Design an enzyme around this catalytic site. Sequence first.
Site, PDB file in Angstrom:
ATOM      1  N   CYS A  28       0.664  -1.608   0.307  1.00 33.18           N
ATOM      2  CA  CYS A  28      -0.304   0.111   0.048  1.00 33.18           C
ATOM      3  C   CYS A  28       1.066   1.363   0.032  1.00 33.18           C
ATOM      4  O   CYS A  28       0.425   2.530  -0.613  1.00 33.18           O
ATOM      5  CB  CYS A  28      -0.640   0.063   1.139  1.00 33.18           C
ATOM      6  SG  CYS A  28      -0.243  -0.204   2.535  1.00 33.18           S
ATOM      7  N   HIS A  89      -2.653   1.230   6.647  1.00 35.39           N
ATOM      8  CA  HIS A  89      -3.274   1.652   5.488  1.00 35.39           C
ATOM      9  C   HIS A  89      -2.996   3.022   4.637  1.00 35.39           C
ATOM     10  O   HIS A  89      -3.697   3.521   5.709  1.00 35.39           O
ATOM     11  CB  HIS A  89      -4.200   0.165   5.447  1.00 35.39           C
ATOM     12  CG  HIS A  89      -5.005  -0.024   3.922  1.00 35.39           C
ATOM     13  ND1 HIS A  89      -3.941  -0.429   2.723  1.00 35.39           N
ATOM     14  CD2 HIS A  89      -5.700   0.847   2.878  1.00 35.39           C
ATOM     15  CE1 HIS A  89      -4.725  -0.730   1.486  1.00 35.39           C
ATOM     16  NE2 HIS A  89      -6.163   0.187   1.074  1.00 35.39           N
TER      17      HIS A  89
END
Length: 152
Positions: A28, A89
């Site tokens: 990510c 994230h």
Amino acid sequence: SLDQCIVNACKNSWDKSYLAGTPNKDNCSGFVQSVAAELGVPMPRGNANAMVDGLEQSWTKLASGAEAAQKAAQGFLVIAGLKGRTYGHVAVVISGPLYRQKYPMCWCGSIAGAVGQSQGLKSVGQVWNRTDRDRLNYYVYSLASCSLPRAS
């Protein structure tokens, strides 16, 4: 249509590997780093938790997922992010309809696999767990990275 440069940067970054040997689709933070690099936006280094730490210290925070989608529609790079106990994230917010009238569409890679991946077709409210999606931070850069429409 003013977020097209961001969407294009996301498409281009999908198959790149910001960290050698690790596809951005599986990382990510790497995916966001490659997007920012194409757009000429300076970023904090490191994994998702480290990137969120850096953005919290330096970028304006938006009030809502709705505002995030609005800024993306004006050509701003907007990062959705949340630190985790073991892994955080991060995702790029794009213009588009809000899921459940709340959660913007996004692009992101993830080591978790398909659940954490989006090529513009999953919302942040489906990428993040129900107990996380209302806790997201939305960071917007200080200028709009996208350009004027073509002159001719």
